[PDB]
Symmetry: C3
């Protein structure tokens, strides 16, 4: 009987102690629920950042695509200009030769015309002297 009463007291105190440890586990679960709520907020902010970065990459891709198209257009324009400059080098070089040839020919014709002018003066003077 004395043994019974002693053990029943121990059981009262052990049941109360177990119930306090169960309340402690409930507080640990509440703290885990707060960690999970915060993790979920962080996952939402990271989702927002990933949307923002993806938009920046998409926009940058479009600007690079526009630059590749502008470079192709400038390439077409320089491709068209280069052979026109090569052609003009040939045209002006051939014109230069023809201008030099004309300057030599006109100089020769002027000298020959001046020699014929003096020949006319000489011959008319001579004929006048015989008459």
């Amino acid at each position: 009987a004395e043994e019974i009463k002693k053990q029943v007291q121990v059981n009262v105190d052990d049941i109360r102690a177990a119930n306090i440890k169960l309340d402690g586990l409930g507080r640990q679960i509440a703290d885990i629920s707060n960690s999970i709520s915060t993790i979920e907020s962080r996952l939402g902010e990271m989702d927002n950042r990933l949307v923002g970065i993806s938009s920046q990459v998409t926009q940058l891709s479009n600007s690079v695509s526009q630059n590749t198209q502008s470079i192709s257009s400038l390439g077409d324009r320089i491709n068209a200009v280069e052979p026109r400059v090569d052609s003009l080098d040939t045209v002006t070089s051939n014109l230069t030769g023809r201008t030099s040839t004309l300057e030599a020919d006109v100089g020769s014709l002027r000298t020959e015309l001046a020699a014929l002018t003096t020949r006319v003066t000489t011959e008319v003077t001579r004929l006048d002297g015989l008459i």
Copy 2:
């Protein structure tokens, strides 16, 4: 004895209440385990998005390097073309002056040849009249 029997019955009750509280905590742990599983899958979907973005940035970086090189090549071609066009403006300016001078010189030679033609007619007429 009646006091003992009553406290043993209350302990039986309290041990059953404790076991109901333990069952409730196990259900809460099962709910947390589910949330953790879903968070771990979300960590994987975000890892996938980051892989996709990183691959887009690598590709874009290659395109930008290709464009910077294409721009330097076009720059070298325009740098080469510009002084060739400046040289052609110099050649053509100098040929323009030379062509104008030839047109004035040929006009003068034509007038002078017509004057000598007239002079030959005048002097021959005069000499014939004296004979």
Copy 3:
């Protein structure tokens, strides 16, 4: 007695509850480890997003430099093109004028040879009459 038996059953049931409580205590410790790893993964992912953003910012500066260089090359080609069109016009006009000069000079050369012959023929004729 029935009391003594129930008190012993209660001892054993309280120990079974403490074992189960200790098991839930270990499961909560394991969940706390899972949370710490998840937090570490979020911190690494935040860093990766910062590193990617920095690379995109640097790449965007290079793209801006290229767009600017493209506008400068555009200005240079815009200036060249009409100068090449002008040179085609000017050289075409000079070519036409040079062919006219060559025809005129050819004509003058023939006319000068005819006047040279005429001076010889007329001087011969006059000499013959004297």
